[PDB]
A paper describes a structure:
Here, we report the complete structure of a bimodular ∼760 kDa BoNT/A large progenitor toxin complex (L-PTC), which is composed of BoNT and four non-toxic bacterial proteins. We found that L-PTC/A consists of two structurally and functionally independent sub-complexes, the M-PTC and the HA complex. The HA complex is composed of HA70, HA17, and HA33 in a 3∶3∶6 stoichiometry and adopts an extended three-blade architecture, whereas the M-PTC is situated on top of the HA complex platform. BoNT/A absorption is mainly mediated by nine glycan-binding sites on the HA complex that together form multivalent interactions with host carbohydrate receptors on intestinal epithelial cells.
We also determined the crystal structures of the HA17–HA33 complex bound with Gal, Lac, or LacNAc. All three bind to an identical site in HA33, where the HA33–glycan interactions are mediated only by the Gal moiety through extensive hydrogen bonding and a crucial stacking interaction between Phe278 and the hexose ring of Gal. The HA33–Gal interaction is well-defined and identical for the two HA33 molecules in one asymmetric unit (AU). To further confirm the structural findings, we mutated the Gal-binding residues in HA33 (e.g., D263A or F278A) and found that these mutations almost completely abrogated the Lac binding. Gal binds at an equivalent site in HA33 of L-PTC/C (HA33-C) but with ∼15-fold lower binding affinity than with HA33-A, which is likely caused by the replacement of Phe278 in HA33-A with Asp271 in HA33-C. In addition, HA33-C binds Neu5Ac in an adjacent binding site. However, HA33-A does not bind Neu5Ac-containing sugars because the key Neu5Ac-binding residues in HA33-C, Trp176 and Arg183, are replaced in HA33-A with Tyr180 and Asn187, respectively. These differences between HA33-A and HA33-C indicate that the known host susceptibility to different BoNT serotypes may be determined in part by the interaction between HA33 and host glycan receptors.
Numbering used by the authors:
A (entry chain B): 10 to 294
B (entry chain C): 3 to 146
C (entry chain A): 9 to 294
Write the structure that this text describes.
């Protein structure tokens, strides 16, 4: 289930620190939202263990390696060796992972947060050996405050009109709080909510009782799947996504007619994957 | 003068898994490596009368003793109560090496992990001891 | 927290036919019994992030899996909420097994001695002897179980396929025929069950939804038909009584037509109300 999954790995002892790779050196670094902190989990069924492979673009064959017998962890060339395999033990009820060496299961990864690197330790109850393994998309987007542009024009953004006008349309980027959205991943529903920053509990919502209309509404309406979305990456792109509603996953966030003029409606429409249904979720500059 | 079952002096330290691998420091860890005939594979064993234990220092680094860290590894450090070892002689010169101190209110001992009796590149650890039958906790001290 | 208060059986990855077995403070490894002697409640402490493993013994009601420190022995002792009575459930992802580490000393984990047929604590390795299968006790009891199914309105009658060529399903007096016996199989992916009639190889109990409420036996090589799958829910206070609802529409429960008990009475599905004609006893064939 984790095989071939690209993930980020962060520390339970410090959730702001992520496994970071450069030129064979593994360290703990703040969130970069890029390939430097992305890892592919490669499952070997015979071993019941995983290789943890760097998604580095320059060096494409680096895996998390225990420099046995030393206390040091690095990324070395994949030679499918025992010191390059790891047991991924999920601590149930705690939603964290213990990462034990296949070469010596007595030894598990230990997060040295003050030295900002990794080492090894026998098992204990400290958070320093517990890690948060998360799908990289979720890792990047969760609690990310963003602006959302259609690819048809990256100079415009999806916005709530104002604090009282809850309609959602396309408009030129003016750095307004009504033009920014804080994305939150709902673990239970396995979906996302877009919180407009001009409000406190206002989320992007498909008004299904009014056809294809989408507007912002309160998030204290608890059980409405129209308030939740699925964000799926477009291949070959770093920031482009398709956004589909949880009530009906065939309903995708759609730029009305593909029109780019100011005040153009933002709606949902039957998914076909056209350019007016692709969006760039970006850092507000 | 002899006070115990294990005379003072220089020894080689081996695992029962291999008669050709020798205990030496590598970085900050301890491991069993190919015979080097160097001082770093020679260990000075000294009996301590007051606590009836042994302290074991590396001949190449005579002020460094076998100890343990807070991560389960056997280490080479300056003198402290973690450097005191309580051997249990189970054969001719085969011993189980217990820490003098109870660790986590248990007996803890030198432990080398094996993969089908292969210990290459394995660090020496300090793990719980329950009896005298754990092969991974049996070590040979050879006077040399 | 997703395992809190769950009642499970625990079996060995090294020998899946051996289960954690409890009696009078003694813990051993024993063949499947499908009763409380091999059932355990997982009790979660959020602060410790660890679990107590409580025996479902009916006589002694406060016994929990206990590490007899400083030995490596395991037993069941009166629950005093002690550290040596708490355990870390570490799921080996992709392997569908658990390593069960002592909360008191996580250097040590449960180890199955399948020749002495008991448990001890051990340091970790890569063998299956420290890996365990933790499963919901209903699933554990019902998975791969060959049974007969009777309405509670008359336990002398059973749900049966008419014969090898007649795939219809009706109520009839038990006669020890293979057409009257079903092998239950749990589907991990679908989280639902299939009832394989033992007179056929690939014949399963199926809601023929294209024909109203009719249920019949059909081939299981029709892959993606939720109507072939069922949820089996225990009725409270009972050891053998279940309601059986269809995966396609969970409001559709296995139903004895009119509550009639005569031979040849139709077995169907119907809107769930929980009446006695929708309650079934899944039992060992004598
Ligand atoms: O809803 C009106 C429609 O207008 C079309 O031009 C556009 O391609 C569709 O995605 C939809 O927006
Ligand atoms: O569809 C026939 C129905 O007959 C009714 O008498 C009974 O209450 C229902 O459960 C169902 O069996």
């Amino acid at each position: 289930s984790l095989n071939d999954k690209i993930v980020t790995i962060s520390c339970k002892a410090d959730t702001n620190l992520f496994f970071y790779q450069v030129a064979g050196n593994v360290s703990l670094f703040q969130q970069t939202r890029n390939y430097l902190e992305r890892w592919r989990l490669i499952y070997d069924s015979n071993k019941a263990a995983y290789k943890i492979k760097s998604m580095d673009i320059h060096n494409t064959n680096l895996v998390l390696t225990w420099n046995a017998p030393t206390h040091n962890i690095s990324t070395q060339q994949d030679s499918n060796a025992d010191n390059q395999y790891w047991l991924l033990l999920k601590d149930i009820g705690n939603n964290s992972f213990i990462i034990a060496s296949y070469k010596n299961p007595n030894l598990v990864l230990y997060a040295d947060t003050v030295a900002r690197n990794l080492k090894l330790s026998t098992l204990n109850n400290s958070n320093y050996i517990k890690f948060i393994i998360e799908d990289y998309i979720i890792s990047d987007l969760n609690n990310f405050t963003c602006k959302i542009s259609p690819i048809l024009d990256l100079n415009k953004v999806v916005q709530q009109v104002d604090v009282t006008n809850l309609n959602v349309n396309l408009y030129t980027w003016d750095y307004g709080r009504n033009q920014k959205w804080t994305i939150r991943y709902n673990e239970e529903k396995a979906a996302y909510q877009f919180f407009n920053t001009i409000l406190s509990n206002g989320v992007l919502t498909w008004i299904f009782s009014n056809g294809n209309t989408v507007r912002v509404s309160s998030s204290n309406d608890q059980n409405n799947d129209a308030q939740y979305w699925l964000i799926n990456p477009v291949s070959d792109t770093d920031e482009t996504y398709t956004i589909t509603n949880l009530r009906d996953t065939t309903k995708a966030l759609d730029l009305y007619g593909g029109q780019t003029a100011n005040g153009t409606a933002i709606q949902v429409f039957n998914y076909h994957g056209d350019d007016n249904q692709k969006w760039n979720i970006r850092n507000p500059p | 003068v002899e006070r115990t079952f294990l005379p003072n002096g220089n020894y080689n330290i081996k695992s029962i898994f291999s008669g050709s691998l020798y205990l030496n420091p590598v970085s900050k860890s301890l491991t069993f490596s190919n015979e080097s005939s160097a001082n770093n594979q020679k260990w000075n064993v000294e009996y301590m009368a007051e606590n009836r234990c042994f302290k074991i220092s590396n001949v190449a680094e005579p002020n460094k003793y076998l100890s343990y860290d807070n991560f389960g590894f056997i280490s080479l450090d300056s003198l402290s109560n973690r450097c005191y070892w309580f051997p249990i002689k189970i054969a001719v010169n085969t011993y189980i090496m217990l820490s003098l101190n109870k660790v986590n209110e248990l007996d803890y001992a030198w432990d080398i992990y094996d993969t089908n009796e292969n210990i290459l590149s394995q660090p020496l650890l300090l793990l719980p001891n329950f009896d005298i039958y754990n092969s991974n906790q049996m070590f040979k001290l050879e006077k040399i």
